[PDB]
Design a protein around this nucleic acid. Sequence first.
DNA 1: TTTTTCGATCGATC
DNA 2: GATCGATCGA
Lengths: 183, 183, 183, 183, 183, 183
Amino acid sequence: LSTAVSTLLESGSLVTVAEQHPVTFVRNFRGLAELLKVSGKMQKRDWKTNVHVIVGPPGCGKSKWAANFADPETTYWKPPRNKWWDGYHGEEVVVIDDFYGWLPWDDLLRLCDRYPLTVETKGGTVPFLARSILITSNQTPLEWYSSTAVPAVEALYRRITSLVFWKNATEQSTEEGGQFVTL
Amino acid sequence: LSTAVSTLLESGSLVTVAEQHPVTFVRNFRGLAELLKVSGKMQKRDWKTNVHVIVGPPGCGKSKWAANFADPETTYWKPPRNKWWDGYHGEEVVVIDDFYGWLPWDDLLRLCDRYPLTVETKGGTVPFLARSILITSNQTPLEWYSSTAVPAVEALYRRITSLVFWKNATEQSTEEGGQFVTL
Amino acid sequence: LSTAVSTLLESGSLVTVAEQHPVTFVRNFRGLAELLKVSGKMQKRDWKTNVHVIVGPPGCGKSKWAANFADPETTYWKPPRNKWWDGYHGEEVVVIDDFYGWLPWDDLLRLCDRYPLTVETKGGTVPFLARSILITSNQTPLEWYSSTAVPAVEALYRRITSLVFWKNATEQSTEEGGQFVTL
Amino acid sequence: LSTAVSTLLESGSLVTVAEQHPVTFVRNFRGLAELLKVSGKMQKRDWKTNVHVIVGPPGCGKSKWAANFADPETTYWKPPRNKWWDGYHGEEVVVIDDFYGWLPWDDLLRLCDRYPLTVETKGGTVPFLARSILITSNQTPLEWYSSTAVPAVEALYRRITSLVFWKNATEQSTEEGGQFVTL
Amino acid sequence: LSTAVSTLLESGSLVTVAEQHPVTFVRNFRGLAELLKVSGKMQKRDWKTNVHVIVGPPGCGKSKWAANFADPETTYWKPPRNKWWDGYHGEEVVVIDDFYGWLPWDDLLRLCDRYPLTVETKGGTVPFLARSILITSNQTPLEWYSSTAVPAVEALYRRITSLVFWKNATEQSTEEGGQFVTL
Amino acid sequence: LSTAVSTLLESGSLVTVAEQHPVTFVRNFRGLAELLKVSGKMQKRDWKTNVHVIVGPPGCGKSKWAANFADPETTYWKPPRNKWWDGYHGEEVVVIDDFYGWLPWDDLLRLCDRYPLTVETKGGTVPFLARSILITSNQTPLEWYSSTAVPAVEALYRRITSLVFWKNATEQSTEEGGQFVTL
DNA sequence: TTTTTCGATCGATC
DNA sequence: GATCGATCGA
Ligand SMILES: Nc1ncnc2c1ncn2[C@@H]1O[C@H](COP(=O)(O)OP(=O)(O)O)[C@@H](O)[C@H]1O
Ligand SMILES: Nc1ncnc2c1ncn2[C@@H]1O[C@H](COP(=O)(O)OP(=O)(O)O)[C@@H](O)[C@H]1O
Ligand SMILES: Nc1ncnc2c1ncn2[C@@H]1O[C@H](COP(=O)(O)OP(=O)(O)O)[C@@H](O)[C@H]1O
Ligand SMILES: Nc1ncnc2c1ncn2[C@@H]1O[C@H](COP(=O)(O)OP(=O)(O)O)[C@@H](O)[C@H]1O
Ligand SMILES: [Mg+2]
Ligand SMILES: [Mg+2]
Ligand SMILES: [Mg+2]
Ligand SMILES: [Mg+2]
């Protein structure tokens, strides 16, 4: 057990213990969770999460690019139209699928921001630790939200790291700066 | 329970652990759930779901062919008019019966894609891993939703793998699929 | 101990497990319940549920007849005018009393079919396994809905098994069914 | 454990026990928290939680200053919009970030008082012990709550300690409550 | 633990057990509390609970009079805005602070009576026994509740034992009951 | 513990196990209750439970008489606006006080019926062995449950044992006859 | 168990 | 004026 406590308290979250000594995590699982939350070393997020938007008409292999962006061991495909992040437990790359505007504006800002955040799950809370949010969508970011119900739409475009677009060509071409508002 | 952990991390289904090991699942039943949920290795969808729309006027055995699709056991029946996939627990056949369009259009566009998804249950979420969604109905897929209310709009009529109509009180004739927009 | 699981897998009921081996049921009770709930498939239904409609002028001794169909201890008396079948555990007389057109049309058509359904309580879902539905009403089954709002429109009468009527202060007469639209 | 309980009863803080001998805190973690609740040595608040308010248009570095106010080992970043102080098991700094009024008025009045408070966590209760509440906002404290729908707007202002404001696109300058409705 | 059970049987207070033998109280705390509940030697209430009401404009110093009143160690500052009394576990100042009616009417009548009452926590129920309640407000009690939406509002004023006011920027001059309404 | 089950499964549970075997009940307290509930030996009831209903404006000693009815040792007070019957681990006066209609009507009837019942507490279920329910109110007993919201108002009337109104501010008088819809 | 989640009320838009 | 959606409270 002190081995499990070593691998937990020294560094990481419960996932590393689950990968190191499972037989000591099937037992004492609630107490490792409370030790982690009380020790204070529960991993915050102190980095910048890249945000790659993808735009294209339905059928252009949008989601294929997302599923091929990283290994399926480290992709959390967020369920749609919910505020719940259930099952996450840290999964580096987060692909918000086909996102037409079904997330609160300030919450979308805070996912794409660069400072700690704890997202919510059904009956608990899980610390957000993503590193590349792939926002697969259908329209340009200028049609997700309306300027009426938003403080300032620039506050989101400031965070879109890259932006792949689909034009009348079988390839998907990145966007060099902004023809529209700059990112 | 050393064998139980090594068997759980490979098959990734608690039912298999219980069946292959009754005794060590009576104890540590919660811990195995948390180990599965945290370690990863949960069975996620990475295949294509095969939609089989069945359509005809009432009383023609729409449901008869729905439950005919083997087995009578491994067939989740989606609760009507609702959002929650409660109690699903992992099946392979999902028979949405007597459809009108009650599932939101985007959720139906997403049930029939080729990528992981997480459905909602009243108290959590359960991974959705289905291989055929028998959408029994009464109308053709053209009039499930209003012509203007759908914004895509040809993203459902792509993924409809099969189709069966009901002709003039004679038999269920497999629709050839060419007359309508292609499938 | 080990023999508890041996006696559970050959019973299918916890009651005998408690009777024969109580000492190891005072401990480990939570796990036998989970084992039964996870190793035994949920109970579907495949039996046409008889729908005996009771209709007459008000106050004609309808409720007493309803309770007299079967044992009152296994009879539900569904909370009227809402959509929460508060469990009730599966109780296999169902008496919807004073029905006058408030359940949705397709929901009622589904409640009286040969294929499984799952009505929902507040905070969960209960499998619906009814051998008899006793629709006690006030007026004719054709006045429950108008043919404009119902695009079926004669699909209910297939599901009605028989009909019970009260003639001009003679008795609760059992209908022929051959004069009006057939049963 | 026989010594761990001795430390717990006289240190009065579960964090101390969790850091001294984690292994006997992994087991018996409910027990220690319940002994601490019963014995009465659970830590209250009797000091004044000095509240810093930061204002300025987005992207000007409000959040960076908030992460540079204290060590990241202690700053608890409040989860947004959802009134659940989960992940808190103490220590001084609390940075409610990007505030716009998403907290009930009385709770914002009562966090900043000098007297004990217990906040909700997801299935429990955590005592509040902060020493600095850095509220970060884009709007002056006037536009957080409407004057008419508030019993007395002067109550919140009395509890603000410092007010830092961004001016003229060069650098944020501390205010003294002259121009603002003073505190 | 036989000594601990016997020393609980006659004293009937978990506080005493936790004072004498913490170690046993750490390991089995649900057991001792349930044993105390079942044996019937709980602590019912048979005494009128004084309700001192303080009214004044904010900043006049209402709450400092509550914070100094009985003892810093035997006051339970009620968590606001909700019906949970967690962590209370005995005794006898209960100071509902900053009140304006955010507690259910019948429950507020019932807190201020002579007959027993069990109050609700996150995990179970802890018996209520308060020798004096201090209620702090900004309005007079005449407008804590809608005078129309309450059947008989005299039943609250009858329970207040002392209604202490704030005069014209001088002091907290105790008002005399029965003049303006009953007391 | 072997003898514990033998004593448990005779009668009069769990009060007599807790009296006779204090040590073995500190452990296994959830499991003895579960074994007893599973077996058909929860000391059931066949006696029509008495219902005394009191009506009078507040301050007229409604609840005083309820307190002065039986021995306080064997009295339970139902905490209002709360469907949990925690504290029923003794019995047999039940005084639902200060009623305004806050119980589900069918359950209220079920408490006043003759059949055996099992109410649910925080941590399982408890048999409802009541003999006298002193339903104390302040308004006319009819208005508690609206006739539209109830299938039959007279069903509640049938199980009332006795009723008491209040006189012209002097006396408690027993109501005799058919001033309202009698039983 | 609590949480849910569900239901009711209020506000805004057509 | 009615229906649907969103937000808040329990
Ligand atoms: N494992 C796979 N095997 C074969 N083809 C695949 C696989 N994964 C993706 N594809 C192809 O990628 C395409 C994805 O299309 P689809 O997901 O419907 O559109 P979008 O990706 O834009 O949502 C399909 O046409 C399919 O042929
Ligand atoms: N480690 C770092 N190295 C260089 N620049 C940094 C570092 N951390 C933060 N910054 C800068 O500080 C700024 C903080 O931005 P942000 O937190 O969005 O401001 P606010 O939250 O107030 O809108 C970023 O623009 C970034 O360039
Ligand atoms: N350090 C201090 N110096 C001077 N006055 C103080 C200090 N701390 C608190 N007070 C005074 O104590 C009183 C009570 O504080 P508080 O309870 O927060 O206000 P309220 O009575 O409105 O709830 C206030 O009037 C405040 O002016
Ligand atoms: N020891 C006592 N001394 C004086 N009066 C008492 C005592 N015990 C009970 N009472 C009286 O009993 C009455 C209870 O009535 P009330 O509080 O109106 O009941 P409820 O609030 O439940 O309707 C009070 O008026 C109170 O004066
Ligand atoms: Mg897609
Ligand atoms: Mg910020
Ligand atoms: Mg105060
Ligand atoms: Mg009363």
